[PDB]
Write a protein that binds this ligand. Structure first.
Ligand SMILES: Cc1nc2cccnc2nc1C
Length: 209
């Protein structure tokens, strides 16, 4: 069972701008996704201070970066609080509607795309380097779901039957044909050291065959 939804008009415009605008500093996508992972790990850590049972779905708080050259996918896995079904379809889109507006007015006043995180819509920067994004997430209060969108104004949501996660968010970036540089170890190491050197969580960079 696959449910197809439509992006809000303002979010579809933001994805079209990210995809069509000429902007060479594409590497900032990883800092936005890592900062997203660090935020979700902060939420579940704070919530577990008044409820240790929230860590029953996994005590470890870390971030993993998994490149795969055969699938041409870059995966950012974190053991954060996760996202519910209400989050994927309505809550994030409601919040992103005002952050997208403020992000567009700033772009017309001199700002550039790299400052997208200051408006709380940095997740969509994944479409700088990805033709399709698949997000596997699991919250303590909801089932495991699979979010997918190749832009174009629509996205899908379904109950994930794959490998269980326990708790966290898994962002799979199906990279564009000319963006395979973000699968090489030295390139990912260079980006992490330059943009995410002080993340208060262990970041493990997986290696390939
Ligand atoms: C799938 C999704 N994951 C997000 C993670 C952080 C912030 N916003 C997000 N928005 C969406 C639609």
């Amino acid at each position: 069972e696959v449910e197809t939804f439509a992006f809000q008009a303002e979010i579809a415009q933001l994805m079209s701008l990210i995809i069509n605008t000429f902007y060479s500093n594409k590497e900032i996508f990883l800092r936005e996704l890592i900062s997203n992972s660090s935020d979700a790990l902060d939420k579940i850590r704070y919530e577990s201070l008044t409820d240790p049972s929230k860590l029953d779905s996994g005590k470890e708080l870390h971030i993993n970066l998994i490149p795969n050259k055969q699938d041409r996918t870059l995966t950012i896995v974190d053991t954060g609080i996760g996202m519910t079904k209400a989050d994927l379809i309505n809550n994030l889109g409601t919040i992103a509607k005002s952050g997208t507006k403020a992000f567009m007015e700033a772009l017309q006043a001199g700002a550039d795309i790299s400052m997208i995180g200051q408006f709380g819509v940095g997740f969509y920067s994944a479409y700088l380097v990805a033709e399709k994004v698949t997000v596997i997430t699991k919250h303590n209060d909801d089932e495991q779901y699979a979010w997918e969108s190749s832009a174009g104004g629509s996205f899908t949501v379904r109950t994930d039957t794959g490998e269980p996660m326990g708790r966290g968010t898994k962002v799979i970036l199906h990279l564009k044909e000319d963006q395979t540089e973000y699968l090489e170890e030295r390139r990912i190491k260079e980006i992490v050291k330059k943009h995410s050197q002080f993340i208060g969580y262990p970041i493990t960079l997986f290696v390939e065959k």
